[PDB]
RNA sequence: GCGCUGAAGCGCGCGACCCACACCCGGCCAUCUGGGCGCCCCGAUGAGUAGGAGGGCGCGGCGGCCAUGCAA
RNA sequence: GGCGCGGCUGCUUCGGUGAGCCGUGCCAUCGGGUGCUCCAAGUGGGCCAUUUUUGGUAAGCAGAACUGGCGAUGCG
RNA sequence: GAGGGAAGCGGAUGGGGGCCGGCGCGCCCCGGCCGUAUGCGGAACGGCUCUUGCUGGUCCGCCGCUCGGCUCGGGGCGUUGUUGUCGGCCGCGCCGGCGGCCAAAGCCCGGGGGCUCCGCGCCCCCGGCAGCCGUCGUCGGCACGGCCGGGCGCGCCGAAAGGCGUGCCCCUCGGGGCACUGCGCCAACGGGCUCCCCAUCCGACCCGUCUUGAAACACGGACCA
């Protein structure tokens, strides 16, 4: 009821103002409505199909929404996700699954010789400063090209800019290595620093990819 | 629509399979379902574990009806010509080619039917009539 | 649940087309009536239409007299609706005119309606012609007339008093 | 909040509902206005007809 | 409903008070109630004649 | 039934729970409301012996149409 | 349903009256629970509970009344 | 399939084992083939008229004159099950406000009475006043689950959500409501059945009949074709 009364009140309001802009434009939009569109040649059939625009944008907003909302019930950033804890410095990981919260599954590449992977109900991961929008999910396991490097030398910064947020917080660095023991997880404290991202996130971004389609997987 | 039409009478069934009451206990005693016909009759009594009997609501949907699992909606085939009809079909159609067909006429059916892009029961058949693994 | 909406279960479902008909062309017609009187103003259609669906007991002979006396001039030599058949039997040098529609005549019933003036007309020109069905006059049963309501078993069948 | 949970429709039709559009725009009503809000009102305030 | 026990507070002044504590109950004057009502039916329809 | 006893008895109050095919809700089968183009749709009621009324399945030989058969 | 106009009639003094009839004008809390016809069925031997009974010590008695169910009704 | 410790109308219901049948699109380059418009030459047609006639076909045979495309392959590039979700329906617990009992428990202040007359203590009433109460009604705020299914856009910025046209009016603070064309129509990842056993119920056999009432210690069947 408090979100929803909001909505109401016009009916429309902004969606009064967009048809003005065109109004504003000049004089039109029955016209580009009956007018257009494409057609003819073609082979076949009744053409009963389909998608690409107009439903397809609101199922993408509404699945937006749970999507910052769930972070504010729960805390933090969303993926990348960094071993606090461990090594000192050393490497980075993204949350592409869940089995369940606890029950995780933490990514990589491996192209040629590759890298490893794990499924956990744990051992070691908090994370940093990033968002995306998925919650967790993506997987199986791919990834590859430069990237046991990149992904890692993506990590380093991260570890650079994480290691130092550790020294300043910290109860202190033995238990961040309780924190990232835990690992299903997470209400308390989020957000510290490390600042900013625009690589960060550009990385995982890629690497959501990496974990997707349509690389060494086809035949 | 029709995936989630076929689903619900598979997956779900009714698969209680109506047999005749006590049929297991006398062999002669038919498999095929009899009403159970007079008053003590737990089954009559239409009672729960007694298997239930047949009535029009047990009945499946109608986009679903005469449908292979697969969800190709056969039609029998005797020969070439019903080939024709089905190969309009295609997509929505599999063949089956009846078992009375012969050995020597099937081939022209199989080979046509592919032409026609129906592939369904038809190959499957084929193979059957060649050996085989 | 309740037992007046059983009893709900239990009005009519009169609705039938006929057990057969055996005649194609009156079989065709009898459809008709639902796709036109839905579709124009034509009341008197739709009441043909169930009287050529269901019974022998409602499919009527109407005699020329039973025209002729009946139609007479004071609703001016309208259209005559007879849904079943005419039958032949006035001499008067019968009717006014007219205008008459059925399912079937006899042929001495067409002679002598065509040779007294308008036109005896089957049902089917009557509605491509009179598509309102307005300007008409269903003239008329029986089955429901003096021989026979109840009056069946052997000697019968009476005023009543016993039977 | 027991009007808009449970009411249904009329003859002329079957019952469609006392859902949103089909009490503002449909309902018969010869009697005053048969929307809903002003419906609640009238019944209760119980005047003519 | 606020001004049909409204007048019955503001003339009177016997009502509350004496009424707590002791017993009988007043003279003077009432003001009516209406009221229309709705009806659901709890038991059904086996073994009722 | 084990079998309890400042209760797992009894009574007076009370709180929360459980529990049907009921009632709701979702999707679907008949009839009827009817509607609309041989076909589609809206909503309601809808156990059943004797039993009436109506639609359909299968048998065997016959006719006209229409095939199948060296693997029926 | 009520009124007026006009004809005809009645029973009961060459006697008193309305009523009837016809003709013509005028003025007026439910919601399909539903009518008629043809042809057919088991019957044409019940039971119980509740209420009211009458007989009988009583009875898982006998025999009525008024009703709901079982018979022919699942499911809890 | 199962077995020498656990109970039965021989099924039902759930689960495992055993057995088995099934299994495309956009673009570019090469090869291949053909082409219409117009002139020729042959031909079913049509709207209609309905004696009759006028305009309008289409394909083929195959040359001339422009100017292009298709198709089978090859090579490169780009593009059945489960789980996240948006929408609807129902459930849930918790928090908060206002009015109803003219509000009031109340406490602090102030005055009088009573009981108890052994005095404490108890009570009652009235005014100002922190205060907060149990219940009706109603409204306000959030967070979750289950089940089922897949109204919205039409210039710009803004990841995102969101705002950016203007008039009115209340408040005259933050802001609010109110008014003003047509048109179209989602993400991730890679099986059936038979018999048995255990759980659970039907369970009262079935079945049919007789009967008010059948498992029936009422009747009929060894079993089948």
Known sequence: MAPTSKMALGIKRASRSHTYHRRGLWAIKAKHGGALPKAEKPAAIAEPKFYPADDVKPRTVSTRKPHPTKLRSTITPGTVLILLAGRYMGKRVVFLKQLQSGLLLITGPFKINGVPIRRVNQAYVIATSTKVDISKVNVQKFDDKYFAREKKTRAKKTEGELFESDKEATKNLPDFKKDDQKVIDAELIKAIDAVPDLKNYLGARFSLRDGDKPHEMTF | ?133 | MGIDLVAGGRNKRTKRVAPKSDDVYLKLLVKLYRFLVRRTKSKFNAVILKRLFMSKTNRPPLSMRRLSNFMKGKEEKNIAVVVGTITDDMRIQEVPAMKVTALRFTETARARIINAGGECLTFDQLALRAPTGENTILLRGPKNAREAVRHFGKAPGVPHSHT | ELIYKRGYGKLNKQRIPLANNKVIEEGLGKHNIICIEDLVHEILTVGPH | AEQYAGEYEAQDKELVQLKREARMKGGFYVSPEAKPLFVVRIRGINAMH
Not at chain 2, 59 to 67: A, F, L, N
Not at chain 2, 110 to 126: G, M, P
Request: charged share 35%; aromatic share 6%; glycine share 4%.
């Open chain 2, 1 to 133: 629509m029709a995936v989630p039409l076929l689903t619900k009478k598979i997956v779900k069934k009714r698969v209680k399979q109506f047999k005749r009451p006590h049929s297991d206990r006398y062999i002669g005693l038919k498999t095929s379902w009899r009403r159970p016909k007079g008053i003590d009759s737990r089954v009559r009594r239409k009672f729960k574990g007694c298997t239930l009997m047949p009535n029009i609501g047990y009945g499946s949907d109608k986009k679903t009806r005469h449908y292979l699992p697969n969800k190709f909606k056969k039609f029998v085939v005797h020969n070439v010509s019903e080939l024709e009809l089905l190969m309009m079909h295609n997509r929505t159609y599999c063949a089956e080619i009846a078992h009375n067909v012969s050995t020597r006429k099937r081939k022209e059916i199989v080979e046509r039917a592919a032409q026609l892009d129906i592939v369904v029961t038809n190959k499957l058949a084929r193979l059957r009539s060649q050996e085989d693994e």
